[PDB]
Amino acid sequence: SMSYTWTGALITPCAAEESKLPHHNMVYATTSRSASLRQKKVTFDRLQVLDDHYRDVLKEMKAKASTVKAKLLSIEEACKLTPPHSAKSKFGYGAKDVRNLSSRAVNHIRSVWEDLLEDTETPIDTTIMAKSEVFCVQGRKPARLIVFPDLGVRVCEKMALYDVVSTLPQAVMGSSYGFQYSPKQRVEFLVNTWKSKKCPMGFSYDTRCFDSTVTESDIRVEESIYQCCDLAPEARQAIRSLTERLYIGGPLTNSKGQNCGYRRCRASGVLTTSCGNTLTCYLKATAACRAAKLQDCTMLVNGDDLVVICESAGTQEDAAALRAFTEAMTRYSAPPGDPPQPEYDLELITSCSSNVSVAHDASGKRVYYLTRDPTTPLARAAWETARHTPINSWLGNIIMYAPTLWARMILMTHFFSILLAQEQLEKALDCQIYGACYSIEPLDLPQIIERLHGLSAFTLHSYSPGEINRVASCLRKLGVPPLRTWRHRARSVRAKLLSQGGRAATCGRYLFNWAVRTKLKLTPIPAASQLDLSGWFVAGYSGGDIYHS
Ligand SMILES: COc1ccc2c(c1)C=C1Cn3c-2c(C2CCCCC2)c2ccc(cc23)C(=O)NS(=O)(=O)N(C)CCCCN(C)C1=O
Q1: Cα angle value 147/150/151 (rounded, 5°)
Q2: Which of 24, 140, 375, 412 to mutate to test the pocket of ligand 1 (most atoms within 8 A of CB)?
């Protein structure tokens, strides 16, 4: 079974494509012009051999799934989960019509749903497009490819599966399900799991082109888990029909409506992508841990992103065991890109593109937090400054990386400076968190941050020398002014925000307290504990077309 087959029709754009900004020669956005390069990478044969460990784990997973009772969402509910700028239907209505419950949209959606009950076999058409993502040069990344069904189908997926994909992974995987954690909760789990071992070893495992390694068997095993839920009859049939007609594979159509080929692996743009990937990664890895005889494994899975922390049995012993792990994973159809390295320092493990590092609070107590190399964040921030973007990655990065030296010194200072200069401070902006779109007001940051990271996110200091160097290195490389310039700029943004009063004075006070030396005594913000953040860190939805507001 080939992950893809191709006809020769191009992966076409549907609108003009900018590759560069209008050191800025280092930043680029991917385009359909590099799609052939990606097609080559993601196209291969999958050989899969299942063993007893795999089957044991699956049954364990299904017994936990069998506690779940999932609800069918109403049309209205599913419509309201649709992002305002979601791709329009080929049937002559758009996302705004869906959210408005326009007659044509609803009647098409109802027709798609009935067709899932009435047709159990006919492959559902999908669109394949090159994704536009910004990066900094190293070699140069080709465009990722996105594969998604029509809008009417996506609304139907929600109806059948939103509650399942939102509830089941935690039911099945418990503390291992990564998307239930805010960054502080994630860091807490990572450090506690590290501290709980007598002699800890840990590694990240990077599967090469995970979506393509996902087999038809994998996707039906996934369905077998969903089917353990108590389901409405129509939900059960829709899940079965969606599985056979969409999830396992189908025809690929370009933006010009030409047939590009055929898919027999995971679609990146379906509701079940994150959940499916998570369950599948967790299944294979847990089995592989047993095959390798890894002792007292604790794992954390976020889709295809995997970290395992375990008991060390000695250096040479662990190496041997990682190799057994990787061989088992490979048998399961998940060979690695980079071979995995055993790690005896928690900070040296990168997972969800992040590592643990340490700073100190105002009292000088150690505080663990999550950080990353800031190159991509800053590149995307630069792009977003210059060109209009719907999804503001800078706002997501400030939220998720609030405690970091770079998020605070550069990102807050820069964007608050711009918002101040355009008087667009209260203006709500979309951003993605674990794949779900969120509309957020910049002036609401300080409360959001206390509730996600604690008050210590405003008082961290005495950062790691290695973290310090990575940030300063990054700035010189990208031509960004050094931290001393950002401290001068923070002081100016701070004074202005304070003088605005209201929610601006709050931002100024809490967000830029680091910039001044005679510091202010920060104490809990009232509206922070009162903030409703339900459904924020509940599940992953990359590619699932989900909007929360
Ligand atoms: C590889 O992709 C990147 C990454 C970073 C930058 C850029 C491209 C584009 C850049 C450099 N740059 C960049 C940023 C980023 C920092 C993070 C937030 C987005 C902007 C600057 C911020 C201030 C400044 C300059 C910043 C800044 O104030 N620079 S400056 O010396 O005072 N100068 C007077 C302003 C020039 C504007 C920057 N510029 C032309 C760039 O090409």
Answers
A1: 115
A2: 24
Separation of alpha carbons 225 and 218, rounded Å: 11
Beta bridge partners of 204: 307
Q: Which domain holds residue 161?
A: 1-353
Picking from 321, 353, 385, the residue at the C-terminal end of a domain is 353
Handedness of CA 487, 492, 498, 500 (dihedral sign): negative
Print the SS3 string covering 112-166. HHHHHHHCCCCCCCEEEEECCCEEECCCCCCCCEEEECCHHHHHHHHHHHHHHHH
Q: How many CA atoms lie within 13 A of 189 on its CB side?
A: 19
Contacts of 436 (CB under 8 A, 6+ apart): 541, 544, 546, 547, 548
Question: How far apart, in whole angstroms, are the C-alpha atoms of residue 222 and residue 292?
Answer: 24
Q: Which amino acid is at 287?
A: A
Instruction: Name the domain count of the chain.
Output: 2
For residues 464 and 322, membership in a common domain is answered with no
Collapse the DSSP code of 275 into the 3-class scheme (helix H, G, I; strand E, B; otherwise coil) and give the result: helix
Q: Are residues 339 and 393 in the same domain?
A: no
In this structure, the residue with its CA closest to atom 42 of ligand 1 is 24
Check whether residue 469 and residue 324 sit in a common domain.
no
- Reduced to 3 states, what is the DSSP secondary structure of residue 255? coil
Measured between alpha carbons, how far is 167 from 226 in angstroms, rounded to an integer? 11
Asked if residue 110 and residue 21 are part of one domain, the reply reads yes
Q: Are residues 360 and 470 in the same domain?
A: yes
DSSP secondary structure letter of residue 345: S
Q: How far is the CA of 412 from the centre of ligand 1 (A)?
A: 14
Please tell me if the CB atom of residue 382 comes closer than 6 angstroms to any atom of ligand 1.
yes
What is the rounded CA–CA span in Å between residue 119 and residue 244?
A: 10
Same domain, 334 and 358: no
Distance 475 CA to ligand 1 centre (A): 9
Tell me how far apart the alpha carbons of residues 190 and 180 are, in angstroms, rounded to a whole number: 13
Q: Which of 19, 373, 478, 483 to mutate to test the pocket of ligand 1 (most atoms within 8 A of CB)?
A: 478
444 is known to lie in a ligand binding site? no
| Domain final residue, candidates 353, 384, 401 | 353
Residues 506 and 425 in one domain: yes
Q: Please give the backbone phi and psi of residue 352, each rounded to the nearest 5 degrees, phi first.
A: 45, 45
- Resolution for this model in angstroms, one decimal place? 2.1
Verify whether ligand 1 is closer than 6 Å to residue 26 (CB atom).
yes
CB of 136 closer than 6 A to ligand 1? yes
The residue whose CA is least distant from atom 20 of ligand 1 is: 382
- Has 150 been labeled as part of a binding site? no
Q: What angle do CA 162, 13, 337 make, to 5 degrees?
A: 65
